Each structure stands twice: as structure tokens, then as C-alpha cells.
Design a protein around this nucleic acid. Structure first.
Ligand code: ZN
Length: 462
RNA sequence: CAGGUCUCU
RNA sequence: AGAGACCU
């Protein structure tokens, strides 16, 4: 992606959009019990912790664009992925505004706890003022779809969250692009059934993990991904995407049967307009992280990317022997012979993609099941039942989370969730974690799950 | 102060 | 109907 221009709002006639400037995060009662290196992200240009210009660092992620149109590898790549999707039988027909607004068995309803975006969020109009769970009213939606139209600008905000000390020094917080309610509704009408099918089918047919439950899914992955593993990381994935990948996505949607009216909506996320504070800017390429379909479209494009890199990097690649699952930019894949990712990374460079060794490794090493990660979790065979696989969130990560809160009223639920993650690391690690919690007065007031109870419930899942 | 998935009372 | 965990 690449910023095409920046203009003052006066010049463009867009309302200003300001976000909160102080973090909601505060040190928790456990802050000094556990070690950790993360602090709330820089939210303000005048943050004492900064070491660079804030706004400069914020938009450095739009590194630029290489290809605008598909070459032959990408075309073949897209067609291979699109054919594989055909067996899913995605319903290319348009979903109903009520279903799109209020949800289905495989698609959650539009979030009403959350901003309506441009221009409502500056006219003091909340989504609860337009929709109603209990009515399933679509009557006010239709009205505002007509008053304000589609292709409304995204509203740029900085993300309030823990970040490592380095990224706080270097001002590399993340940006969130608030969609307009109008475009969410309409994208959900055009692609709702695709979303539904994807959510229902995590695995190697969709090539996607959206909708997986790591407790159970992790036992399936070494069967779905047989042979030699490969993996790697992306830097600035969403923003590094050139328009060719949106052209490639259009190819897939077409091949599985979407109308041209449906396929036309892709250009409206490849080319977007954003308001940050008092300015308007234009972005070409780059996924707008905050549009409907963000996780799924990023995942689909990733499926195209991997295929294209393989056949352009190596000779004799049979794409039918590829197995992969993606969650946005996160990927785990296998092939019947080892794949050198150093060479894939070099081809990736020509495509404007920056690919690094899996898991912040210094160099591209071998990936096996003992050191692979996915959604940050390792893979650890159960000592009693080795075919049952524990997802393992690292204790270091869990320590970072517990050292802060945004609202100490819900401390019980926070610590419980971490316990659900911790116990997979084993009895010894879990009792060490629990007893550190107990070492402090509110720690003795919490209801903490029993290890063998967690385990027994896990086994019952099968 | 966005789009989502997962889990819990 | 609440809450938390995790991906962008
Ligand atoms: Zn533009």
C-alpha cells in the first residue's frame, strides 16, 4: 500500500475525527508479582517515552506498491485456489439486510457496542439509534443507506493496547480504520454466505483458521498438514499489499461465480479514503484493517500469495500437494519435500512483501512440530494421549497480560481466561503460575480453576 | 476509540 | 443479556 495524497479537511469537506489520547490501561494488583516488558502504546505525539516523530512512524507501514496487475504465476495461483474452493459450494447470492444486520448461525450480528463510523460518529448518531436486536428492524438502515451512500471514508484511530518497549520508543502503535456502518452492512450483504461457509469450515479446503477453536483444532493440524512443514512471518502485511493481490482476489471471486456487481466491491477496499484528525488521505493497495471481511480477505489473499511464490520460486511444484491454513497473515503449511523460505522470501520481496523467519528467529531455520507456532501457540503432544495436541500459549505472554487492566472490576474473569490458556503448559507450570497469583491479597479472593478439572474437561471435548 | 473469531457466568 | 481471552 501507498498514500496517494493528503489534504486538509477544509479542502475536502470532511468532519474531523479525534480519538482518546490517554490509555485506559493501568498497572494491576499483579504488576510487581510477575515480570514483563510491555507498556500501553504511544497514543499522543507528546508522549515522554517517544524517541522519534510519532505520526511519521504511524504511517511508515505504507511502504509502497510493486505490481498493479497479475503476472502468470499469480493467475495460476488464483485459479488453483479458486477451483479448490468450488467443492465448498459457496452461495454467491446476496444475503438479506436483516440477516446481514442481525446475524445467522454462522455469522455474528453487527456489533452494537461499537462506533457507527462516518458520518454518524460526528453527528452523535450511535448504531443503537439505527438498529434493534429485538425488533430486527431494517427500516431505519435503508433510510440512511440512501441518505449517506456507500464508499464512505474510514476514520483513523490509534489502538489502545500493550506494546513492547521497542515499539513504544519507535512510536510504532497500530492504526484502526473505523468503517462506516453503511459499507459494513453492504459488504455483509454481498459476501455473508462466503463468511458463513468460511466460519463453518476452518481447515485446508478454505485454507483458513477463522472460526477454529485451538483446544480441538490443534489435534487436527498435523493430519491436515502432512509431510514437511514450512512457516514464516510478515512485516506490515495488510499495509504492504500491492493492488495486484486485490486484482488476484477478484479473479477468485469471479471463478467461484460472483456477479460482476459483487466483484466490483473489491476495488472499493483497494482504493480507500481515510480521515485522521484534521486531514483526509487516500490509500492505494493495503487492506483497510477495520472493514467487513478483514480476517477472511487477508486469509484468502494469503492463500493466493503462497501458491504464486511456490511456482515462481521452484521448478516442478505440484500445487495439489500444498496444504496450508491461514489466519490473516499468520500461516502454517506443508509439502511432501522441504521448502526453503529464504528463497520464497526473496521472491516475496519482488512482490513488495517483507517475509521474515518464523517466530522472530534470526534466520530461516527448519520448522517442525516441536517449534512451530500458530496464533502464538505451540504444539505439545499430551503425555497420556499423544495424538491429542495441546495448544501452548507461552507463559511469558500470559505474564504480560496479567500485569495490567482496563477495569479492575473484572479481574476474576481476566485471571480465569489466562488460567484456561496456562494449564496446557503442564501441571508444574500451572501450579507455579497459580501460586504466584495467590501470593497477593486479591489473589486469595479469586476462584481459580483446578488443574485436573481443566484437563478432564479438555479430554471430554473429544 | 474498527472488522472479526474463540471461550466463559 | 453481561464479561474476559486471542487475530488484524
Ligand atoms: Zn483516492
Amino acid at each position: 500500500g501507498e498514500i496517494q495524497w493528503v489534504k486538509p479537511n477544509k479542502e475536502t469537506g470532511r468532519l474531523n475525527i479525534n480519538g482518546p489520547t490517554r490509555t485506559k490501561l493501568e498497572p494491576s494488583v499483579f504488576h510487581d508479582v510477575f515480570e514483563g516488558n510491555k507498556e500501553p502504546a504511544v497514543l499522543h505525539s507528546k508522549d515522554p517515552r517517544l524517541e522519534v516523530d510519532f505520526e511519521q512512524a504511524l504511517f511508515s507501514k505504507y511502504v509502497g506498491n510493486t505490481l498493479y496487475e497479475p503476472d502468470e504465476y499469480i493467475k495460476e495461483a488464483a485459479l488453483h485456489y479458486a477451483n479448490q474452493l468450488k467443492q465448498l459450494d459457496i452461495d454467491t447470492s446476496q444475503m438479506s439486510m436483516e440477516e446481514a444486520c442481525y446475524g445467522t448461525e454462522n455469522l455474528e450480528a453487527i456489533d452494537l457496542h461499537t462506533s457507527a463510523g462516518y458520518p454518524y460518529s460526528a453527528l452523535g448518531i450511535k448504531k443503537r439509534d439505527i438498529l434493534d436486536s429485538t425488533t430486527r428492524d431494517v427500516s431505519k438502515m435503508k433510510f440512511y443507506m440512501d441518505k449517506y451512500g456507500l464508499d464512505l471514508p474510514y476514520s483513523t484511530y490509534v489502538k489502545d493496547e500493550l506494546r513492547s518497549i521497542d515499539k513504544i520508543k519507535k512510536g510504532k502503535s497500530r492504526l484502526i480504520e473505523a468503517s462506516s456502518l453503511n459499507d459494513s452492512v453492504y459488504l455483509r450483504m454481498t459476501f455473508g454466505h462466503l463468511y458463513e461457509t468460511f466460519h463453518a469450515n476452518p481447515g485446508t479446503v478454505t485454507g483458513s483458521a477463522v472460526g477454529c477453536n485451538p483446544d480441538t483444532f490443534w489435534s487436527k493440524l498435523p493430519i491436515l498438514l502432512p509431510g514437511s512443514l514450512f512457516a514464516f512471518d510478515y512485516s506490515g502485511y495488510d499495509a504492504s499489499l500491492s493492488p495486484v493481490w486485490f486484482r488476484a482476489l477478484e479473479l477468485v471471486l469471479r471463478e467461484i461465480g460472483y456477479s460482476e456487481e459483487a466483484v466490483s466491491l473489491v476495488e472499493g477496499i483497494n482504493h480507500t479514503h481515510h480521515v485522521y484528525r484534521n486531514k483526509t488521505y487516500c490509500v492505494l493497495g493495503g487492506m483497510p484493517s477495520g472493514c467487513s471481511g478483514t480476517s477472511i480477505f487477508n486469509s484468502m489473499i494469503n492463500n493466493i500469495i503462497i501458491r504464486a511464490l511456490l511456482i515462481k520460486t521452484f521448478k516442478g511444484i505440484d500445487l495439489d500437494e500444498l496444504n496450508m491454513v491461514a489466519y490473516g497473515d499468520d500461516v502454517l503449511a506443508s509439502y511432501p519435500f522441504p521448502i526453503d523460505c529464504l528463497e520464497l522470501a526473496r521472491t516475496g520481496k519482488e512482490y513488495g512483501l517483507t517475509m521474515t523467519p518464523a517466530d522472530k528467529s534470526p534466520c530461516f531455520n527448519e520448522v517442525n512440530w516441536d517449534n512451530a507456532t500458530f496464533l502464538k501457540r505451540g504444539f505439545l503432544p499430551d503425555e497420556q494421549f499423544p495424538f491429542l495436541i495441546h495448544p501452548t500459549m507461552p507463559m511469558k505472554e500470559i505474564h504480560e497480560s496479567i500485569r495490567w487492566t482496563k477495569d479492575a472490576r473484572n479481574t476474576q474473569d481476566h485471571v480465569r481466561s489466562l488460567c484456561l490458556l496456562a494449564w496446557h503448559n503442564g501441571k508444574q507450570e500451572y501450579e507455579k503460575f497459580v501460586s504466584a497469583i495467590r501470593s497477593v491479597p486479591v489473589g486469595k479472593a479469586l476462584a481459580i480453576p483446578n488443574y485436573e478439572n481443566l484437563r478432564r474437561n479438555w479430554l471430554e471435548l473429544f
